[PDB]
Design a protein around this ligand. Structure first.
Ligand SMILES: COC(=O)N[C@H](C(=O)N[C@H]1CCCCC/C=C\[C@@H]2C[C@@]2(C(=O)NS(=O)(=O)C2(C)CC2)NC(=O)[C@@H]2C[C@@H](Oc3nc4cc(OC)ccc4nc3C)CN2C1=O)C(C)(C)C
Ligand SMILES: [Zn+2]
Length: 197
């Protein structure tokens, strides 16, 4: 009882910069500072952009702001708080059935707008800032136009699928792999987020 520990917070450690003509990853906090920030829950770093790179003590993945909520996957974040300038912030959405969690979007972030285009030509953004064309194949499935080893997609759960106009269509959840090659992806449709809200 006396020695029971607490899990740390999720910490923003970087972002996928989509502000210009060239997408690229940026690191904003190193591993040591990440560990300290996870324990205190106090992160005074400036946040920018729509897609954050996030970490716990044991995992790293992505998180995406849509309509003022920073969304990610439950299999990355669990029920963890997120670190923020004034201390840890509790999830405002948790849905293990959808593999979805969300926190109020951090000050300085920018939010994507949910797609209403009804378009099936999509783009997946990875933690390495690769922009991967994806053809929508169902409510929660899309095929990669150019399949890639699952190694390429690992660590990108929580990232966005976007339409041609840059609206959010979904949150990347899982890869569909045959013999280690991802030919398709599974995503949380933005309509499920909009409902959750
Ligand atoms: C050939 O068989 C297949 O293809 N079968 C497919 C399949 O299992 N794919 C697996 C392949 C795993 C190989 C690597 C794939 C590369 C990237 C991948 C984007 C990521 C990701 O990057 N993660 S990550 O690295 O950031 C990380 C780890 C730090 C966070 N996502 C996952 O890894 C998810 C997690 C779990 O999926 C769910 N876990 C949960 C857990 C919950 O509570 C704990 C609640 C709901 C939930 N819902 C789930 C749907 C398995 N997974 C898959 O992708 C399907 C989806 C079953 C059809
Ligand atoms: Zn759209």
């Amino acid at each position: 009882m006396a020695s029971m520990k607490k899990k740390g917070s999720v910490v923003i450690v970087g972002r996928i910069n989509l502000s210009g003509d060239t997408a690229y990853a940026q690191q904003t906090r190193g591993e040591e500072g990440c560990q300290e920030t996870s324990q205190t829950g106090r992160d005074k770093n400036q946040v920018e952009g729509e897609v954050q790179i996030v970490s716990t003590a044991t995992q790293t993945f992505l998180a995406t702001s849509i309509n003022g909520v920073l969304w990610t996957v439950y299999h990355g974040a669990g029920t963890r708080t997120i670190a923020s300038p004034k201390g840890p912030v509790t999830q405002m959405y948790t849905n293990v059935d959808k593999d979805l969690v969300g926190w109020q979007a951090p000050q300085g972030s920018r939010s994507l707008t949910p797609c209403t285009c009804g378009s099936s030509d999509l783009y997946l953004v990875t933690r390495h800032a690769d922009v991967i064309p994806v053809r929508r194949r169902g409510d929660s499935r899309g095929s990669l136009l150019s399949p890639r080893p699952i190694s390429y997609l690992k660590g990108s759960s929580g990232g966005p699928l976007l339409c041609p106009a840059g609206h959010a269509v979904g949150i990347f959840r899982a890869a569909v792999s045959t013999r280690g090659v991802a030919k398709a992806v599974d995503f949380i449709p933005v309509e499920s987020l909009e409902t959750t809200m």
